[PDB]
């Protein structure tokens, strides 16, 4: 009865039975997914532009638009893409997405591993990725994270130059979360300020290996921070509802027990810090 109540609640939250993931399941796209069971919902997937529909799977990337649906359209919420990240086979696809979406801020929640391969050149260097040139115009590190200032242009028009700020979290442990949330809160603060300075900017791209665990954690924390900042400390904070709201847009967002608890820890610290600054 307790069990059956809880089971009923879980059944009502089930979305993988409601929304198809045809595109990610295509055999033509097998090499474009890290995991065959971590796929974008068709309804919210990012569709790559300029692709030939006669080439099976050509428009596919393992990424979804994520909207903060707890803020109204009048409340100036930031928008996100939750993406699989740093997969060597899809690096050109990633930059196509970044360009077409007009994204000016990219958030990477992993260090390199060797599989997570860099998709930027070294400082002062320039590299081609499909139709695009990327130049690394500087790297600015803290203890916990790194800002790389990128400039991107089409190969066919070098006058068009676009600044992209690449934020890479360096301190996130393998198979766990940061011991304290201050680093992530600081990181998100910088990210938010950057995005706010660019009113024309497209969505913030957030990625991790699978694009659901760390990615979902970062996005949910950011959304809750935005909700508190926008609506105030008197506002109702419902983390479970927020997670369910993002999971309807990409399955499995916030994957682990440690991530789930971390969201509470981070938001508790954010509230307390805020109150200390308000002298409240």
UniProtKB/Swiss-Prot annotation:
Its main location: cytoplasm. The keyword Lyase does not apply. It is found in: Cytoplasm; Nucleus. Phosphorylated on tyrosine residues. Binding of KITLG/SCF to KIT increases tyrosine phosphorylation. Phosphorylation at Thr-149 by TAOK3 leads to polyubiquitination and subsequent proteasomal degradation. Ubiquitinated after phosphorylation by TAOK3. Ubiquitinated by a cooperation between ITCH and WWP2 via 'Lys-27'-mediated polyubiquitin chains resulting in the reduction of its association with LCK. One of its GO terms (cellular component) is cell-cell junction. Monomer. Interacts with MTUS1. Interacts with MILR1 (tyrosine-phosphorylated). Interacts with KIT. Interacts with SIRPA/PTPNS1. Interacts with LILRB1 and LILRB2. Interacts with LILRB4. Interacts with FCRL2 and FCRL4. Interacts with FCRL3 and FCRL6 (tyrosine phosphorylated form). Interacts with CD84. Interacts with CD300LF. Interacts with CDK2. Interacts with KIR2DL1; the interaction is enhanced by ARRB2. Interacts (via SH2 1 domain) with ROS1; the interaction is direct and promotes ROS1 dephosphorylation. Interacts with EGFR; inhibits EGFR-dependent activation of MAPK/ERK. Tyrosine phosphatase enzyme that plays important roles in controlling immune signaling pathways and fundamental physiological processes such as hematopoiesis. Dephosphorylates and negatively regulate several receptor tyrosine kinases (RTKs) such as EGFR, PDGFR and FGFR, thereby modulating their signaling activities. Belongs to the protein-tyrosine phosphatase family. Non-receptor class 2 subfamily. This is Tyrosine-protein phosphatase non-receptor type 6. It comes from Homo sapiens.
